[PDB]
Design a protein around this ligand. Sequence first.
Ligand SMILES: CCCCCCCCCCCCCC(=O)SCCNC(=O)CCNC(=O)[C@H](O)C(C)(C)COP(=O)(O)OP(=O)(O)OC[C@H]1O[C@@H](n2cnc3c(N)ncnc32)[C@H](O)[C@@H]1OP(=O)(O)O
Ligand SMILES: Cc1ncccc1COc1c(Cl)cc(-c2ccnc(N3CCNCC3)c2)cc1Cl
Length: 392
Amino acid sequence: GGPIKIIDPEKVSKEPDALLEGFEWATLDLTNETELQELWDLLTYHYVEDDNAMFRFRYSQSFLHWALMSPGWKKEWHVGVRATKSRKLVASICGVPTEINVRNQKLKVVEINFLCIHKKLRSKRLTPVLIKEITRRCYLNGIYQAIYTAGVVLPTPVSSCRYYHRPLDWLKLYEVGFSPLPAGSTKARQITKNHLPSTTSTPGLRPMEPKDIDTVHDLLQRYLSRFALNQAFTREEVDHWLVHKPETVKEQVVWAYVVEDPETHKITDFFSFYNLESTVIQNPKHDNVRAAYLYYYATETAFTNNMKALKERLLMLMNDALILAKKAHFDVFNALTLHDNPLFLEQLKFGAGDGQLHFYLYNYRTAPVPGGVNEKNLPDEKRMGGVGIVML
Ligand SMILES: CCCCCCCCCCCCCC(=O)SCCNC(=O)CCNC(=O)[C@H](O)C(C)(C)COP(=O)(O)OP(=O)(O)OC[C@H]1O[C@@H](n2cnc3c(N)ncnc32)[C@H](O)[C@@H]1OP(=O)(O)O
Ligand SMILES: Cc1ncccc1COc1c(Cl)cc(-c2ccnc(N3CCNCC3)c2)cc1Cl
């Protein structure tokens, strides 16, 4: 396990490659609100859909601000293509820097995201061109490896994880065609199945505060060390990725909650989730699915390696996260089979999803890592330990 090739810094081109006639390269400045608007305009109509063209991801402008201007960010890695005459933004590809651990080798990488071509420009082989240009921009800045996820199979996947969905407002989900009504059942019976308590159960549960950063940083790092592939968080990354700033962010995107032990007052667990809507492409009575996605978490209980005790602790914590998300008006709680999630998905009534996320490394070779599923693509507790990075 190691890099595939060494990039010769002396030979990185200062000029980008040629584009389709009528189009030109443009760095995006997402500090300019009109440019953030442009990116949002493009993703809102042209980003990731299911196969039935029912749903499209609808990242908010707030989410994009948050996802793309994280610690160590560079505008140079926010790449646009525009039409030369009208100036219209027609494609994008983006990165932000982070460090990852790949089987206890630490690597400086770009996370690549928000690859997007306007529907009218599809099937013209612009993707490889986008990919080559961001690669060039990264090489110039001293970064030679990447990580990304996609829902399509490409060469040499590192892992593969299945999406799971816990209805919070079952009837909303049923009405937009997201959740089916099985079959021998009724609306009343699905609502009953999905009922949650009105209050949380874990003692000392409260929202995270800025004062919690150093302890959450420590516990998260220890927790994530238990996975072959994981994100190697810095303290700035804990602040950015976990601690909502209501002063400065009007439309909250991240929620995080800690458990302050009632006896010792040390934080013993935490969990977090983020706000990511999908647009309901063509439905009478609703227009959006308001999803919360489980993000990072950690529990002291993990380090006993009592798998029994770990499941019990995660059942309570995750049910609390469901309750908190319902309380914040989310329709669905979404999670993948990564981390230790196969311990709690099926019992907390998450339904298996159609979507799958495939994980890839650029210019780094490593053995595959388990992604929390077996050969039937069902959660498996003996197939965890592999993926400990959640990309947005
Ligand atoms: C050191 C630093 C390096 C940094 C770079 C690391 C690599 C990063 C790589 C990317 C990380 C992205 C992470 C995310 O953001 S994943 C999300 C991607 N976005 C969407 O799904 C939004 C909706 N779709 C679109 O906007 C377009 O359909 C896209 C742009 C996806 C393809 O446009 P189009 O449909 O018009 O295709 P084409 O004719 O231009 O080109 C076809 C070629 O493109 C290859 N392809 C298709 N889909 C993907 C895909 N998701 N990852 C990598 N490659 C992909 C494809 O196999 C074919 O290759 P080949 O037939 O020649 O083999
Ligand atoms: C509810 C919904 N909203 C928008 C699109 C698709 C769906 C249905 O369930 C999913 C979900 Cl939630 C996600 C995906 C998916 C698959 C592969 N890549 C992605 N993206 C690229 C990586 N970031 C997440 C978006 C999404 C695919 C499906 Cl089928």
